[PDB]
Amino acid sequence: ALNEGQIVTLAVDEIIETISAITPMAQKAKKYTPPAASMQRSSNTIWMPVEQESPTQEGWDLTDKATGLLELNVAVNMGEPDNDFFQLRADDLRDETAYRRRIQSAARKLANNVELKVANMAAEMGSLVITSPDAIGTNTADAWNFVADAEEIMFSRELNRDMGTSYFFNPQDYKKAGYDLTKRDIFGRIPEEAYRDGTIQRQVAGFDDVLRSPKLPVLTKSTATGITVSGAQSFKPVAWQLDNDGNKVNVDNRFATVTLSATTGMKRGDKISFAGVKFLGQMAKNVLAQDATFSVVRVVDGTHVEITPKPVALDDVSLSPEQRAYANVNTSLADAMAVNILNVKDARTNVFWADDAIRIVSQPIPANHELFAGMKTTSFSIPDVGLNGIFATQGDISTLSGLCRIALWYGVNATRPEAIGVGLPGQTA
Amino acid sequence: ALNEGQIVTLAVDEIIETISAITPMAQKAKKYTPPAASMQRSSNTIWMPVEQE
Incomplete structure (x- = not known):
């Protein structure tokens, strides 16, 4: 019929969208931008006050019974x-249409990495652990128990x-959990933005x-066995606390360090509990039926490990009233109580927290300073998470190419x- | 007593000035800048005649 020259055309305006950009965990995280000048001199560390607990007294006469502050x-x-x-x-900047889409893809990938880091941090440093011996969906109310006891x-x-x-x-x-959870559902429809954002039930x-x-992430099993505390x-x-010079250095409220008989199988992010140690009500210091659980922050030696929450015993006799106000454990660690390993199987983690338990600390990169003259630098907002980054370009004459x-x-x-808490199903070894 | 977070303060405004150097010899000695374009073609050298005897 009509034999004429052929063309190949690209849709300028229609980009096939792939890869979702949901960040449910990062949006529940709080964002903090400290003053950058002081952050530079403080080794990118700032200390945050924790809300202080008050000892209270009863009666009219409190003579010589005041407490200090902590x-x-x-x-x-x-x-x-x-x-x-x-x-x-x-020559590749003649069209400048793949360049912009690469900038957008970079924004999305950076947000994705933020979300991944948040999830892995939560899994690694989560104190409360809930465990089910079999997989979710076995027995009768495994899913309900799994969520409800958390x-x-x-x-x-x-x-x-x-x-x-x-x-x-x-x-x-x-x-496997939704089959039971949807039947026992109180809340109604989710707003469509939330439903597409990740939240499935309320x-x-x-x-x-x-x-x-x-x-x-997937939490690997702990290989450690037969571990007991070594000394009270x-x-x-x-x-x-003081140091060798005698100067007062800040102590983290979390991050207790304990001495164990052996520290071989355990690695950062596993879950432990001590025999006879129970959680305590934080306000009314009552002995909860649930055994106190800890996650190890890191392993320092073959006999010492660092765990996330400080076990502060209520019955400790040497604590002051100011100190005892922060007791979270019924009793301290005895001379030799067995350490119960709670990572017995390699199970993908379920994470729960009270919102804003995770904080995201962000800082600017001042590459717009006069020290950086051959390079073109501008602010770069990644609004999906809420973090401002930096966008910089610099080309060289020998190749006629830019970075x-x-x-x-x-x-x-x-x-x-x-x-932060971690739920581990099917833990039997 | 009051147990609280400890900070380390640094007073950038107040600088402990320690050294003050004087440079009289370089102020007494004269400065000359021969034309740069001619200096480039020479080996950064000028020749001056000495008083004749």
Whole structure:
């Protein structure tokens, strides 16, 4: 018919969208931008006051019975900056339509990495642990128990939850839990923005949002066995302590260090509990039926480990009233009580917290300073999470090519590890 | 007593000035700048005649 010249056309305006950009865990995290000038001199660390607990007395006569003050603190820091980096020759900037889409893809990938870091931090530094011997969906009310006792421990612990509470399922375990959870559903329809954002149910066992995150990591089993505490150790809630010079250095309210008989199988992020040690009500110091659980922050030696919440015994006789106000454990660690390992199987984690337990510390990169003259630098907002990064370009004459860097500096911090919790199904070994 | 977070303060405004150097010899010695374009073609050298005897 009509034989004429052929063309190949690209749709300028229609981009096939792939890869979702949901960040349910990062949006429940709080963002903090400290003053950068002081952050530079403070090694990218700032200390945050913890709300202080007050001892109270009863009666008319309190002669010689006043208490001092005790304010504890936690420290937040940063990590290495995350960034995207690509190069282009001069002739490739004639069209400048793949360049812009690469900038957008970089923004989305950086947000994705932030979300991944938040999820992994939560899994690694979560104190409350709930365990089911079999997989979710076995027995009768495995899912209900699995979610409801997590809520129950976070509730009876009387931890702050005014910002709300969130349960994050991994998708594969929610596939088995939702069958039972949907039948026992109070709340109604979810707003469509929230439903597409990740939250699948609301007000489940009095637990606000129940979400579903595909970035929850897999928690490897602990290989350690036959571990007992070596010597009687009591911990005291202090704000500071002296050093060899005799100077007062701040002490983190979390991060207790204990001495164990052996520290071989255990690695950062496993879950332990001590025999006979129970959680305590935070306001009314009552002995909850649930055994106190800890997650190890790191392993320092073959006999010493650092665990997330300080076990501050109520019956400790040497604690002051100011100190005893912070007791979270019924009794201290005896001479030799067995340490119960709680990572017995490699199970993908379910994470829950009280919102704002995780803090995201962000900082600017002043590459717009006069020290940086050959490079073109501008602010770069990643609005999906809420972190401002940096966008920099610099080309060289010998190749007629330029480099594009999109750097984002942030830190993920678990300021209330006692409020982060990890649910582990099918733990039997 | 009051147990609280400890800070480390640094007073950037107040600087402990320690050294003050004087440079009289370089002020007494004269400064000359021969034309740069001619200096480049020479080996950064000028020749001056000495008083004749």
